């Protein structure tokens, strides 16, 4: 005689990133093995009734994380790498100028004058030489 | 005699990224193995009644993550890489200018003058030489 | 005698990205293996009654993630890569200018003057030489 | 004697991306293996009654993710890559100018003057040389 | 004696992208294997009663994801690639100009003057040379 009663009430299970081998990153450079590994986990969750007898569940399991990293020649030369710019502003708030007078002679008013040339990146590669064999 | 009763009430199961080997990233450079791994997990979830006997579930499992990384020649030369620009603004809020007078002589008013030349990227590659064999 | 009762109530199962090997990324560069892996997972979910006997479920499973990365020659030279621009604005809000007078002589008013030349990308490739064998 | 009762109530199952090997990404560069993997998962979901006996379900399964990456020669030279532009605006809101007077002589008013030359991309490839064998 | 009762109530099953190997992406460059993998999954869903005995379901399954990537020669030279433009506007809202007077002499009013030359793409390929063997 075997009786199994299962009455869960509002089982709320949330799983965002369980065993996902996800590579979410910016690679601006290079010559690099990114996320060479895998995901071989067993996030077991048990909540109900169980009953087992005279069995053979698992045996001779083999999960070797064998990584062979043998880069022979790798060259990264004369490189200019820039990743991010964030919130680069130039503000002139409430710029008030009053030039009053009588029988005067205004000559030159330049409220701005070449205030900025470059803001984020001015990457230059001038007369750069590289030799190999 | 075997009896199995199963009465779940509102089982809310949410699964966003369980075992998805997802490569979601920007690769501005190169010569790099991106997301070479896989996903071989077993996110087991059990909530109901179970009953087993005299069985042979699993055996001789083999999950070796064997990665062979052998890049022979890799060259990244004379490179200018830029990834992101975010919120690059130049603001002139409430610019008030009053030029009053009587029998005067205004000559030159330049409220702006070549304020910016470049903002994000001015990538130049001038007279760059590379030699190989 | 075997009895199995199954009365689930409002089973809400949501699955967005379970085991999908999805490559969702921007590759502006190159010469890189993107998302070389696969998805071989078993996200098992059990909620009902189970009953098994004298069986042979799985055996001799082989899931080796064997990745062979052997790039012989890879060249990335004289490259100018730019990925993103976001919200690049130049604003002139509430620009008020009053030029009053009597028997005066206005000569030159230039409220703008070549304020910007380039904004996002000015990628130049001038007199760049590359030699190979 | 075997009895199986199955009375689910409002089973709402939602599945957006289960095991779809979907490559959804922009490849502006090149010479790169994009989404070389597959999808061979078993997202098993069980909710009803089960009853099995004296069977042979699975055996001798072989799911090796064997990827052979052997690019011999790959060249990416003298390249100018740009991906995205977003919300590039130049605004002049509420530009009010009053030029009053009596017996005056206005000469030149230029409220705009070549404010921008290029906005997103000015990709130039001038006198670029490449030699191979 | 075998009895099977099946009375589901409002089974709402939604499946958007289950196991579809769909390649939905823009390839502006080239020389790249896009979505070389397949979809060989088994998203099994069970909700009804089951009863089996003395069977042989599956055996000797072989699902190797064997990908052979052997590009011999690949050249991408002197390329200018641009992907997207989004919301590139130039606005002049509420531009009010009052030029009043008595016995005056207006000479030149140019409310606009060659404000923009190019907006999105000015891809130039001038005097670019390439040699091969």
Residue numbers in the entry:
A (entry chain E), B (entry chain B), C (entry chain A), D (entry chain C), E (entry chain D): 94 to 226
Sentences from the study reporting this entry:
Here we report a 3.2 Å resolution cryogenic electron microscopy-based structure of the 22L prion strain purified from the brains of mice engineered to express only PrP lacking glycophosphatidylinositol anchors [anchorless (a) 22L]. With helical reconstruction techniques we obtained ~3.2 Å resolution for much of the a22L fibril core with stacked rungs occurring perpendicular to the fibril axis at a spacing of 4.75 Å. All a22L fibrils sufficiently isolated for tomographic analysis (n  = 41) had a left-handed helical twist. Residues 94–226 comprised the a22L fibril core, forming major N- and C-terminal lobes. Several general features of the a22L core were similar to those of the 263K, aRML, and wtRML structures: a PIRIBS-based architecture; an asymmetric fibril cross-section spanned by a single monomer; N-proximal (N), middle, and disulfide arches; a steric zipper between the N-terminal residues and the head of the middle arch; and preferential exposure of cationic sidechains in the amino-terminal half and anionic sidechains in the C-terminal half of the cross-section. In the N-terminal lobe, the backbones of the a22L and aRML structures can be overlayed closely from residues 94–110 and 133–152 that form the steric zipper between the N-terminal residues and the head of the middle arch as well as the base of the N arch. Among the more notable differences are in the respective heads of the N arch, in which the trans side chain orientations of two pairs of adjacent residues (Val120 and Val121; M128 and L129) are reversed with respect to the polypeptide backbone between the two mouse strains. Notably, the a22L and aRML disulfide arches bend in opposite directions, yet both form a more acute angle with the N-terminal lobe than was seen for hamster 263K. Thus, variations in shared conformational motifs within a parallel in-register β-stack fibril architecture provide a structural basis for prion strain differentiation within a single host genotype.
The normal cellular form of PrP (PrPC) typically exists as a glycosylated, glycophosphatidylinositol (GPI)- linked, membrane bound monomer with a largely α-helical C- terminal domain and disordered N- terminal domain. In contrast, PrPSc is multimeric and when purified, at least, usually takes the form of amyloid fibrils with ordered cores that are high in intermolecular β-sheets and loop structures. This aggregated form of PrP is able to grow by refolding PrPC and incorporating it into an ordered, transmissible assembly. Prion strains are infectious isolates that when transmitted to a given type of host exhibit characteristic clinical phenotypes, neuropathological lesions, survival times, and PrP deposition patterns.
